[PDB]
Amino acid sequence: ECLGFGKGCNPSNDQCCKSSNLVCSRKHRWCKYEI
Numbered sequence: 001e002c003l004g005f006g007k008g009c010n011p012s013n014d015q016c017c018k019s020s021n022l023v024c025s026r027k028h029r030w031c032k033y034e035i
Contacts, residue, residue: 003031 002017009015009024009031016022016031025032 005031005033007031 001015002019003009003015003022003024004017005020005022007016007030009029011024011026011029014024016024020031021033022031023034024030
């Protein structure tokens with residue numbers, strides 16, 4: 001699983017890419033970058 005930054009995803013399952021520091025947000029429901 002590896003979604004690009006700012007991609008619609010599920011925060012419960014979390015399908016964002018870990019290599020690009022992406023996490024599924026709950027309010028935005030997408031891949032966000034922690035800065």
